[PDB]
Design an enzyme around this catalytic site. Sequence first.
Site, PDB file in Angstrom:
ATOM      1  CB  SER A  15     -12.503 -49.782 -12.025  1.00  0.00           C
ATOM      2  OG  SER A  15     -11.584 -50.713 -12.594  1.00  0.00           O
TER       3      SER A  15
ATOM      4  CE  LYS B 229     -13.438 -49.077  -8.154  1.00  0.00           C
ATOM      5  NZ  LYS B 229     -12.380 -48.215  -8.727  1.00  0.00           N
ATOM      6  CB  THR B 230     -11.337 -44.104  -9.398  1.00  0.00           C
ATOM      7  OG1 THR B 230     -10.865 -45.359  -8.898  1.00  0.00           O
ATOM      8  CG2 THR B 230     -11.003 -43.014  -8.413  1.00  0.00           C
ATOM      9  N   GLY B 231     -12.797 -44.585 -12.023  1.00  0.00           N
ATOM     10  CA  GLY B 231     -12.561 -45.383 -13.215  1.00  0.00           C
ATOM     11  C   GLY B 231     -11.621 -44.622 -14.131  1.00  0.00           C
TER      12      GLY B 231
END
Length: 233
Positions: A43, A181-183
């Site tokens: 993501s 932002k995480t992923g």
Amino acid sequence: AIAWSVDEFFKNREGTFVIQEVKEKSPWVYNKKRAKERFAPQSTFKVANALIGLQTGAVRDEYDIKYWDGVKREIDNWNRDHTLGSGMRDSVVWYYQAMARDIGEERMNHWVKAIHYGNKDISGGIDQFWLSSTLRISPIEQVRFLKQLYEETLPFDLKNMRTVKRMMVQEEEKHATLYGKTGSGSDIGWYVGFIKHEHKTYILATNIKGTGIEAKDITYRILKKYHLMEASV
């Protein structure tokens, strides 16, 4: 200049950290082998996808509402209406998949190539390619991309870059704003973004064999160690 030292945050995880103040000519890197290796963005691709969706007109703005289709997905929070902005904050994959389908393969290929997004390979499928799939980007390449987003030198309209940055705000403190932002997935854990602290801005990427939540936690701990983020007072 900051004399970075981060070994103590990676004692139990294989990982890499890349950080660069915007006036510095090159990033500082922990674990350069992994920093240059490309991984599925998971993501974290929402940053690029949102820019492309806005630029192409696939979505109107950060408040573009898409209706839940009534399909019960595994995360309850997904099973309701969302916007481009809520979808980034809550990492609502289906929203961004719907947007990707509207962008379409031809425009998506062009834009992914134009922004040097890793291997640029979207052949895994228009609504699949960023999810443990064909597209891969290195931590070093994430920092190059995000530095251009911060500096507003990507080939997107200024308005769209400003919108996406507002959507990325993660922490607001007296003397700093963290954007990121995480992923996560397939044992790839990302946290990518940038922190403005006073008159300095640091672009960063954390990537571990682990989860996005873990990568975000490591990031916060590093930023706190160096007083870029406030302690939990």
